[PDB]
Amino acid sequence: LQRVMAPTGGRNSIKYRDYTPCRNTTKLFYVDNKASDIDTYNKDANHSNFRTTVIHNQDLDADTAATESIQLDNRSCWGGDLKTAVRTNCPNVSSFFQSNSVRVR
Amino acid sequence: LTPDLTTATPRLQYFHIAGPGTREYLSEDLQQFISATGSYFDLKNKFRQTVVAPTRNVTTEKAQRLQIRFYPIQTDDTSTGYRVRYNINVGDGWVL
Amino acid sequence: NQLELMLRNATNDQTFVDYLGAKNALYSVPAGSTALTINIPARTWEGMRGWSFTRIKAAETPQLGAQYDVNFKYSGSIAYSDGGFYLSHTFRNMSILFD
Amino acid sequence: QPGQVLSYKKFLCDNYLWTIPFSSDFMYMGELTDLGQNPMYTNNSHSMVINFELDPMDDPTYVYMLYGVFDTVRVNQPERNVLAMAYFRTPFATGN
Amino acid sequence: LYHDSGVCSGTLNSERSGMNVVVELPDRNTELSYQYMLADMMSRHHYFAL
Amino acid sequence: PTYNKIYYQAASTYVQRLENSCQSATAAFNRFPENEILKQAPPMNVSSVCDNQPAVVQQGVLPVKSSLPGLQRVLITDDQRRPIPYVYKSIATVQPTVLSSATL
Amino acid sequence: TEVADALSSHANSKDARSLRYEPYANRLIKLQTAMVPPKVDGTSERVAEVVKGLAEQGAIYPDQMGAIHSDLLNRVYTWNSMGVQESIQALVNDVIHGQNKVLQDELARTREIANASMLTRFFDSLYKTVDRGQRNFEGFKKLLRLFVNNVPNAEVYSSGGSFSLQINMGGQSQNINLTNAFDNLKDIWGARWDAVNNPRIGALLTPNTRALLFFVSTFYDYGSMEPGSYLDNLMRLYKEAIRA
Numbered sequence A: 001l002q003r004v005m006a007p008t009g010g011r012n013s014i015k016y017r018d019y020t021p022c023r024n025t026t027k028l029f030y031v032d033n034k035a036s037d038i039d040t041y042n043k044d045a046n047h048s049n050f051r052t053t054v055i056h057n058q059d060l061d062a063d064t065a066a067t068e069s070i071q072l073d074n075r076s077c078w079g080g081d082l083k084t085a086v087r088t089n090c091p092n093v094s095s096f097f098q099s100n101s102v103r104v105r
Numbered sequence B: 001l002t003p004d005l006t007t008a009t010p011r012l013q014y015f016h017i018a019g020p021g022t023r024e025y026l027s028e029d030l031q032q033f034i035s036a037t038g039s040y041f042d043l044k045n046k047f048r049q050t051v052v053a054p055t056r057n058v059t060t061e062k063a064q065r066l067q068i069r070f071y072p073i074q075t076d077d078t079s080t081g082y083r084v085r086y087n088i089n090v091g092d093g094w095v096l
Numbered sequence C: 001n002q003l004e005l006m007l008r009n010a011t012n013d014q015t016f017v018d019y020l021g022a023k024n025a026l027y028s029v030p031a032g033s034t035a036l037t038i039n040i041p042a043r044t045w046e047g048m049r050g051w052s053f054t055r056i057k058a059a060e061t062p063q064l065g066a067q068y069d070v071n072f073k074y075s076g077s078i079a080y081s082d083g084g085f086y087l088s089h090t091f092r093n094m095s096i097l098f099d
Numbered sequence D: 001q002p003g004q005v006l007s008y009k010k011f012l013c014d015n016y017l018w019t020i021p022f023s024s025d026f027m028y029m030g031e032l033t034d035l036g037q038n039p040m041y042t043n044n045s046h047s048m049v050i051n052f053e054l055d056p057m058d059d060p061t062y063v064y065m066l067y068g069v070f071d072t073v074r075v076n077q078p079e080r081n082v083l084a085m086a087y088f089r090t091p092f093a094t095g096n
Numbered sequence E: 001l002y003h004d005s006g007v008c009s010g011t012l013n014s015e016r017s018g019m020n021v022v023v024e025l026p027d028r029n030t031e032l033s034y035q036y037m038l039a040d041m042m043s044r045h046h047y048f049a050l
Numbered sequence F: 001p002t003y004n005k006i007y008y009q010a011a012s013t014y015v016q017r018l019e020n021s022c023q024s025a026t027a028a029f030n031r032f033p034e035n036e037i038l039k040q041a042p043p044m045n046v047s048s049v050c051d052n053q054p055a056v057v058q059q060g061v062l063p064v065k066s067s068l069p070g071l072q073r074v075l076i077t078d079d080q081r082r083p084i085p086y087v088y089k090s091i092a093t094v095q096p097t098v099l100s101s102a103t104l
Numbered sequence G: 001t002e003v004a005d006a007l008s009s010h011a012n013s014k015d016a017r018s019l020r021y022e023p024y025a026n027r028l029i030k031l032q033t034a035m036v037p038p039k040v041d042g043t044s045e046r047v048a049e050v051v052k053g054l055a056e057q058g059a060i061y062p063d064q065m066g067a068i069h070s071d072l073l074n075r076v077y078t079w080n081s082m083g084v085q086e087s088i089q090a091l092v093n094d095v096i097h098g099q100n101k102v103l104q105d106e107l108a109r110t111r112e113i114a115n116a117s118m119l120t121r122f123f124d125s126l127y128k129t130v131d132r133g134q135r136n137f138e139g140f141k142k143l144l145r146l147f148v149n150n151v152p153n154a155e156v157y158s159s160g161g162s163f164s165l166q167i168n169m170g171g172q173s174q175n176i177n178l179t180n181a182f183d184n185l186k187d188i189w190g191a192r193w194d195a196v197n198n199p200r201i202g203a204l205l206t207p208n209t210r211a212l213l214f215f216v217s218t219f220y221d222y223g224s225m226e227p228g229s230y231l232d233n234l235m236r237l238y239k240e241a242i243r244a
Helices: B028-036 C001-005 E030-041 F012-021 G001-006 G024-035 G048-057 G063-079 G085-106 G109-126 G134-150 G179-184 G197-202 G207-216 G229-243
Strands: A026-029 A050-053 A070-073 A077-086 C014-017 C022-029 C035-039 C050-057 C091-097 D019-023 D049-054 D061-067 D071-080 D083-091 F002-008 F046-054 F054-061 F067-069 F072-073 F087-094 F098-103 G156-161 G163-168 G173-177
Touching: B028 C001, C001 G048, C022 C035, C022 G134, C035 D061, D049 D061, D071 G063, E030 F002, E030 G229, F054 F098, F067 F072, G001 G024, G001 G134, G048 G063, G048 G085, G048 G229, G085 G109, G109 G134, G109 G156, G134 G156, G134 G207, G163 G179, G173 G179, G179 G207, G207 G229
Parallel strands: none
Antiparallel strands: A026 F087, A050 F072, A070 F067, A077 F054, A077 F087, A077 F098, C014 D071, C022 D061, C035 D049, C050 D019, C050 D061, C091 D049, D071 D083, F002 F046, G156 G163, G163 G173
C-alpha cells in the first residue's frame, strides 16, 4: 500500500558520477576526431589505432574528461551491442598490403 | 568482480580516505603480524590510514580578520627614541 | 602461508596513495602575458586538500602523456618532472572563486 | 645623493611549489582537510575559477597548477594469481 | 620509464584474471611524486648511486 | 571495405589506341609496336576497379568490462595484426545491456 | 552499530556523543554504514577457517595451507551456489566441532592444563589488540597466564560467557570474574601514570578489577608492562603490598 520506488543506482543502472545513474542500455560513442591532446603527440597514432574519451561531456575538456570512467555495474554481467562504421580509401597496389611488387627472372 | 564493490560500501571508507583506521579495519591478526615482524620486513606502509581534521567547534566560520594591523594612537617622536602607543583590540570570543 | 591467507581477507588488503596527492594541470601563459584565468566546470570537491602552483617554461616542459614530444628540444632539468622549480616568484597574486 | 637612489626589494624561492591548504585557518589538521569534508562543498558541486596575474616573462610558460586530491588505490588479492586494483580520486573523480 | 602516459603505459596483471590492474593518468605526476616522497623521507644532499 | 566495381569497356582496344594516341608520349606502354609478342597488352572489355565503400557492420553483443575508463583505445588491424593506414574514418558505438546477474 | 544504540538511548548517551565528536566524514560514514549496511561475503574466510582447521588437525601441512585454500576457492567459486555454501558451512561447523572435541580433552587432563586451555579460550574470546597500551595488555595476559600456571589451586571456568576465576585459600574461596574485569580494564592500558589519571581511574576500577590485578601482581616483573603506565606502577605497589 506504499509506493517504494525502484533503486536509482540499481542492478541495471549505469553510474557515471554524482549525477543520476542512467538506467540500462545506454550508448557509448567512439570517434577518432575528438578535440583532445591524447593522440596528437602519440607517435604511431592513426585512424586504425587511436585513443578517444567516451566522455563527451559538454563542460569538461576532452583531455580532462578522458581521466574519468564509466561504471556500468558490479551486480550484473553486461554486454555491448557493438556496431562499427569504418571508411577506407586504400589503393589497389600498395607496399602496406604487399601487392605492388613481384619477382621475375 | 570483488565481493566488496558489489555492495553499498562508502567510497571514502572503502579506500581508507575517511575510514576507521589501520588499527581497527585490519584483521586483529594482521596488526600483530606487522608489529611483530616490523623490525626487518615492514608491512605498515602498505595499509593506508588517514588523519582527519576536527571540522567543528575549532574554527569560526564568522568573518574574522586573520591578521590585524594597529596604527599608533600618538607618536611623540624625539631625538633619542621613537615612542608609539597602540590600542591592541581582542574582541569577545577572540584570543591573541 | 599464514600471511598469504590473512592478507587475502577482504578487510586487510594493500592500500596505496600517491605521495604527490595532486591532480596536475598545465595552463599555457604566452610570452608577454601578465595575467591568467583558470576556469573549470562544476566539481564535487569531496575531500580537496588545497592548491599548489608555480609557473614552468613551456620550452622546458614536455607534453603530458606524450609518447614522443617533437617540440621538446630541451634537455635540461624539467621542473615539472623533478622538483627543480625556480619560478615560484614572478607570481603577483591569485584569487580562488568556488562559485 | 640620497634622492638619486632607489629600492629593489625582491625575493627568490626555488623548489617550493607555493602551497595553499583547503583548511579554514590555513593550518594542517589532517590529510582530509577542514573544509574538504564540509557538506557545503562535498555535496554541492562548485565550478571554481582561479584568476592570476603574473610578472611578464619573455617566453611562453605553463602555470603548473596542482589541486589537492586523494588518488588512492586498494589492491584486492583474493586468491592465487588473482590481482585486481580499484582506483579512486576524491575531488576530480576518476574511478566510479 | 613511461610514467603518467595513458597511450604508452605499462601493464601489470595476473593470468587467471587477465585484467590490467595498472592505470596511468596523464594528469598525475609520478616522477614528481617520487621526488617529493624521497625528499620527505630523507635529505636530498645524500648521493645514492644505485 | 574494398569492392570490385565491375564495368564493361565497349571497345577496349580501340579506346586504348585512342588514349595512347594523345598521351604526348604515344609509344609509352606500347614499346615495340611492330612485335606481336612484346606489343602492349590489349585491355579487357570486362574488368573491375577497387571500390572503397564505407563498411557499416554490427558485431553483435559481446561481454564488456564493468569499469569502462574514459580513455578508450579503438584498434583496427588486418590479418597480419598491423594497423591499416588507409582508414580516414572509423566510427564505433557500444550499447551495454544486462546479460545476467553476477550474484547469488 | 553505535548509531542504533545512540538513537535508542537517553538524550546524550556515550555513543550519542561518540558520533558527535567524530569528524563530519567519519560520522557520515558511520551513519551510512548503519542506515544501509554493506553486505559481506562469507566465503574466502570460511574456506580459510576450513584449511586452518585441516592444518591444525594435521590433515594438511601449514606449508601448503595457502595453495590448498586458493584451490578450494577455485572449486567453490566455479560452483558457487546455495548447496555448496551449505557444504562450506557444514565444514566450518565441522571445524568447530573438532575444536570443541579437542578442548574437552584438555579439560580431562591435569587441572593445571585444563585451566590454562580455558584461559587460552578466554583470551581468544575477547579482543586481541587495543588501540592504546597494547604492551600493557599482553603483559597482563602473560602475567595472568603464569599466575594461573604457578598457582596450584587456581580454577578457570565459564558461566554463560562470563569467564570467572576461583582461588581457594582453604578456609575461603574468593571468586573474581575476568570478563567484566577486562571490560573495565579498557582505556586503562594506555594510562600514563601521573597526577590526574590516578584519581580519574581509581574510581573507575571496580572491586573485581582491583582484586584481579592484585592477585595477578603476585608474579609481576619490571619487564612486564610499560615503564610509566598506571597499571605498571600499580602492580609495583601491589606486589610489595603482597610481600609486605
